[PDB]
Design a protein around this nucleic acid. Sequence first.
DNA 1: TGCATCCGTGAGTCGAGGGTAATAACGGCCTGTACGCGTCCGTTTCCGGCA
DNA 2: TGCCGGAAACGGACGCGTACAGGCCGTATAATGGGAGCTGTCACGGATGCA
Lengths: 49, 175, 1111, 146, 49, 98
Amino acid sequence: WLSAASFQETTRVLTDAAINCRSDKLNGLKENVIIGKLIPAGTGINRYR
Amino acid sequence: QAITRAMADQARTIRIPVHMVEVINKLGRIQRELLQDLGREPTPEELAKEMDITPEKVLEIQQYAREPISLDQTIGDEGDSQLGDFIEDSEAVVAVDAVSFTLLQDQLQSVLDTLSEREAGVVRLRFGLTDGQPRTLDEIGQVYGVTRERIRQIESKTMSKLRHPSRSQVLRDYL
Amino acid sequence: NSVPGAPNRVSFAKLREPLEVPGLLDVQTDSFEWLIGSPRWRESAAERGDVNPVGGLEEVLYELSPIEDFSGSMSLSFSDPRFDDVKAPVDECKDKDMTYAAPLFVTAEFINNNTGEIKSQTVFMGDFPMMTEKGTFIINGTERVVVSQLVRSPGVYFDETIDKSTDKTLHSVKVIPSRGAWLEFDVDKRDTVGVRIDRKRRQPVTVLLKALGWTSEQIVERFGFSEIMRSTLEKDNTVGTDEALLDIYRKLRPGEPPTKESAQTLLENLFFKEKRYDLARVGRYKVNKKLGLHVGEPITSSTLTEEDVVATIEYLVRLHEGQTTMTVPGGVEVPVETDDIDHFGNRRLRTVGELIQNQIRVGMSRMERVVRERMTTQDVEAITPQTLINIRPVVAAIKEFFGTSQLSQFMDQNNPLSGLTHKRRLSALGPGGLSRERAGLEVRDVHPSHYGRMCPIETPEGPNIGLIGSLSVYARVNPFGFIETPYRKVVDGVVSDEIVYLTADEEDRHVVAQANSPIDADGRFVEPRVLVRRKAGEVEYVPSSEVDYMDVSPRQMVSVATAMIPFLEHDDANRALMGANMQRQAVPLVRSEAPLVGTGMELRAAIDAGDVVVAEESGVIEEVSADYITVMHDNGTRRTYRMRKFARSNHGTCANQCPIVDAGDRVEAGQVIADGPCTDDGEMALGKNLLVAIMPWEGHNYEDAIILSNRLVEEDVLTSIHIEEHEIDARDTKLGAEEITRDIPNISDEVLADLDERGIVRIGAEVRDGDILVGKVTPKGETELTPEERLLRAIFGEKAREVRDTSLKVPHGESGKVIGIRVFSREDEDELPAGVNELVRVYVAQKRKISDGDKLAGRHGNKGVIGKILPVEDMPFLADGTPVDIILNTHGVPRRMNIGQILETHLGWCAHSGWKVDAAKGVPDWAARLPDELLEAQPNAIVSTPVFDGAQEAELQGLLSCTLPNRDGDVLVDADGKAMLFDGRSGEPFPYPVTVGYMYIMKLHHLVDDKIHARSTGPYSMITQQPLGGKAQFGGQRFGEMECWAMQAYGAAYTLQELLTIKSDDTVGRVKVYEAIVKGENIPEPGIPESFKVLLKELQSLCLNVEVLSS
Amino acid sequence: KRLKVVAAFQQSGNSPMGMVLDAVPVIPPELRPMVQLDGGRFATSDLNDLYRRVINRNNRLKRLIDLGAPEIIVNNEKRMLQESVDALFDNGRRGRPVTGPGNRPLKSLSDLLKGKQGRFRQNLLGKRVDYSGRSVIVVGPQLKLH
Amino acid sequence: EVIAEHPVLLNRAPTLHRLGIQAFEPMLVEGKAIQLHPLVCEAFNADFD
Amino acid sequence: MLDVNFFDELRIGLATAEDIRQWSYGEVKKPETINYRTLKPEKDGLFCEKIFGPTRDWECYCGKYKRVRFKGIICERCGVEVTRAKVRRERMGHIELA
DNA sequence: TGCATCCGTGAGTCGAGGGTAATAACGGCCTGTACGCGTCCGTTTCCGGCA
DNA sequence: TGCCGGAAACGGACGCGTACAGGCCGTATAATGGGAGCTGTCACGGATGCA
Ligand SMILES: [Mg+2]
Ligand SMILES: [Zn+2]
């Protein structure tokens, strides 16, 4: 839900993600950037990190 | 009465007393009437004379009467930037004086260690270095089993010693 | 000619012009004078419409007065506006930060109806801001100019649309007023002509007619051919005037219990009483022209009318029917056709007079409301007009218009051209005008009605492309606000000398000739077929008999700044646009020599810009100096003019004014008496003349990079003076009062060497980045100190020093001397803002040289930064050893379609060298049409090629053929215009000839010192903890979303984490990373961003439970 | 369409009773700072006005209720409170947007997230950074590629 | 000495594609203009106007 | 809660009245923001120190405690928890609608 | 069932930039807050004798 | 010269008498439903109300 909210139509995304009690997994690429953890691409994956 | 009282009480973001807002409106009315029947903007001394208060009181009232602004108005010619992003946060850490103070503490610990244990302990207890509360001569004497006169003699000799250039040439630039 | 001291600038113009360039500041001056009611405007209007000369203020007071109560038992009136002398002179206002204003006086009359009593009083309306000799306003010291606005005139506007489904035309009409409601009569997919009022679509025209009182028989009689309207009558399903009024009320007024008398007056209030529906004089005139109601009636009664409404409906139905002409019963016949909004017959120009009049009206409306409110509450027979009137709303409206309004722009002054072109500026965006987001591509186009009324070239190239324009040189503004254009009327092929001003409608009605039409030097046309612009903008060949109008002169369609571009007709349009827009950003140099080759619009542009002192009355120069000139008039009296030595312009540029007359010269009223910032001998000079090469040199002039000779640095050819000011106010505080003094806490005596006894620096004392300019101290108060600080203070014997140091320090990256210090005080009774006890201004000026990175540009938009400044020795030089000064690139010329620079270079070389046409055996054929005193010219002579009628290419070739030698027998430039250059670095001659000449280039206001910026650790934002932005504060660069995408795409993670966490937002991370860098340790791991924490708090505040979970 | 939200409510341990609001939360003051500028001029954060309106209308409703007022006045005050809370959560979503001085619409909590000026696209994805610079550029034909 | 062998990044707005960010080895120069290698102008879409 | 940057989920749910009043440290019941004269936050106002923490580092409202030694204690007279000034950034309040 | 109406969303990128409309005003009182000399702890000179 | 060992003012806690700051209450002819500013974007999707 975080990626969709940061992308577009934030009000409509939040009002339906909250109702669904949706829980993010922070496994994508925008979420790691938002929360300040290393992205899972390039030198951020476990193979190299 | 109710409408005036409520408007005075809740008209502004910064609350103003009823008498203060009353005198503010009185001063505004007086200024408007004076400008109308004079043709020239009057001086604060003239306002004070007409309202029968002091000019410093007039200036204080005028300063109080000002209302705040909003941190989200488009200040620029185009609308892409608010007012709040042009304001410095003075409460933040300078990020340079912090490391300067850390190294000052390190140097102070060194210059203290260049002396002996007795002097270092008494001066640290006296000025509250290891603890926030600075102890007094009576407390130091009670801790060390000697009198406050002996503590004062030690403090004086240590203060004289620390003013030598061999011990102040490193601490001079930290002020 | 026509200027007594005009330098002899020989011109290449082929054809004479009958009409001279009008006063370039007329659009401002005449407008404000009409607003005032000045005798000059009064006599002009008497010459051109003496029927009713009324000023803006007079019109406002007349349309306001009289003011009545609800009972109508007592009234008040206003009359006779009259101004007073200015309260302070212009220079004094600009210095002491006042506003250039003058008191306003009116004659208010209070009249009682029941008893009968008149009370005439002199009422002071307010301090009315005034417009100076140069057409600019001064508000709080600074100079401001209010730009004219382009808005669509109110009236009727018909259009047709295609439904693209049934493929039938759907006509419509919008009667758009000013200060009123809307109403549209469209044609639907079916045959029910809708009457949408205030965006409520229902209710065909039959109901509206019945509400107006028209019976079905009258409707059928007036509209018999209308099959659509007869069908609507058949399916009206509503009969009765009162029933129609009931329907009107329930539709337009939901939620209100309708009555039979409220509805009877609702329509009259909405569209017939002037209180709530007043289309302006322009709207009434436009409606009368479009329908043809009254052809001779003086314009009045600005409210709508039922005859106008029925005429509009009939116009719509006949337009749908497909007729060609219409005759209103009792009115002249008028053609029927669609109306275009982009046509300049409908886009009136709301100038400064009308803008200030509108603000005055909206203020006086509030004043009249207050008068009416207090007029009933206060007891009768005990009131006077002084008690009645409140002028605070009016003065507040004037002030709130002049300040904080995007139509009242900060008058940019980089040069007199910049000032002049900021005047005469037409901006389509503003209050009541279209915004950029709603600005479609349709309006950003050069409609064919712009010819002679607005420049198609000059306009901003950024996001405002097409929304901002400038008036043409010969353009004139109609009293209604339309833009006129002069023309010479031709009769039976005889081009007369009578000049008739036409607007868009008249120009479309008639047939115009071409400016460069080959007249026979007698009035006739040599060829029957001439170029012609038709009504729809069509360009055709027409026999000379049908032509009935002709342009006054070539270059009429162009504006001033673009008319200053030589060889314009050879340039493209985009590069001409760039050159015109970048001619206004040139900085004033220290010498400002006149250009070699130019147009005839430099002398007029300079002397009409107001930045050149000109003797008003003829006489003999008595005393001349660097500060003042005393002209001894022909009759006894003398007059002294004060120059402006090193005055700061609004954009930090020098504004010197050097006299150009000696102690015994005689000057005639109108002669230039003193140069300006960018002037030379009276005419205009935005740059210098520099030797030019068109060869690519070792990749330093690569991709619009520019190479400069060091001679410009050595001799200060391109060296500008920039003046910056600093303001610091010692103000009252809660804990005490700040004072300006030498005694600054925790400071040494080294930095105090340059400070005088009272705290401020010395005049002429140079300053460097980080110095002390004004020593100000603030009461610090009571604050707990660290134990280490206490120990240090005890060790060194220094006291607490309970006040804090906040002194005016010159910011990062500034240097230069100090010119003057202006210090205000409360003790000497100066007008200071409340709470400020001491104010002081320090002026710092630096002599900036030319350097790499500085922006240079010619007059054809061939811009470019300075790549490298070579020494004099290693630059190409001609056969005689003269080195070139600048080195352009050849690749940039052809693909930008601006060979106008090449032609200018050739003509400049010809002008600099000097030529002589050898007419030993007759005048050569190529120079047959060349004017006299042009076959031979002295070296370094100036020429003047006009915009659209100038030097031809054959004439350029002929001039280049004869290029009389410099000092020895040597023609350094061959016939082609090239030369043999020697490589000053290696030594061997260049294997092929290279074009050389004297181009005119200017130093732009995009200097490196204003752009270079850096940051390591500075101030931080308040709500979020990110660094600030911009060079004004310290600020850091913005790492945008696209940069983040590139960072991610690079396979990169750690750099992104660093730039997003321990560089911007990690509050407990920035200090740790700084400490680690200082001590030489590894960079610690980052933390979560404070911005993310703020987002989490905001989400929790929006009643959205957000919890971060570990497992 | 209905079963979408119905099943969304049903499948979780979530209750639809929370959709109606009984206790509005207050954002921490630091995120809506009241800063004093140079010269004693203050500058609000435009959320304080909305919160003040909410508090004033709630208190006035309490006073009317415990004093005893006609249903017309009580319902009008309740609608006042409802509209004020709606403006606080999303200004301009319904009806005329609430505006302060200068006819400038106020900024609500949802305006801090919507659009390009929202928190996400303005500070969460792209931020001003330290150790940065900016200057004009010239050609360096004598330099190497690296 | 402290700048020798310390790569820096150059950015140009807009950053259309991946090659809008590149890393170079800095060298101190006079003036106040960031000298740019002529061969990266294509990648950066940067002219010297 | 402590944000040690070891996260695996970010759950957004429909907050309830109990959740809001559990988040809130106190209830604001007066529409004052700042005192016009002393420039100190008003009691129970939109900036109340008692609810949202102290404006100054380790300094209560009446000054009875002004040093690090009194850390984590509650001023029995003023009602302000004496702690770091940054705390005013993380505490929330709630309004009990009538 | 189709049709119109309406609503809502998004529509660039880098500097240059910081302060505003609109009136009963007093008596009586009252409790609270403050705050200006004096004697105490304590710290910067004092001065009498002195080594 | 510096040190020793107290001695001289410059400053934290105050009853007290006073200043004023702020708040509450109450005013008596009669007056009894708003100003008001808007409505020059364009494509898309979708929900709603009614023929
Ligand atoms: Mg470019
Ligand atoms: Zn306390």
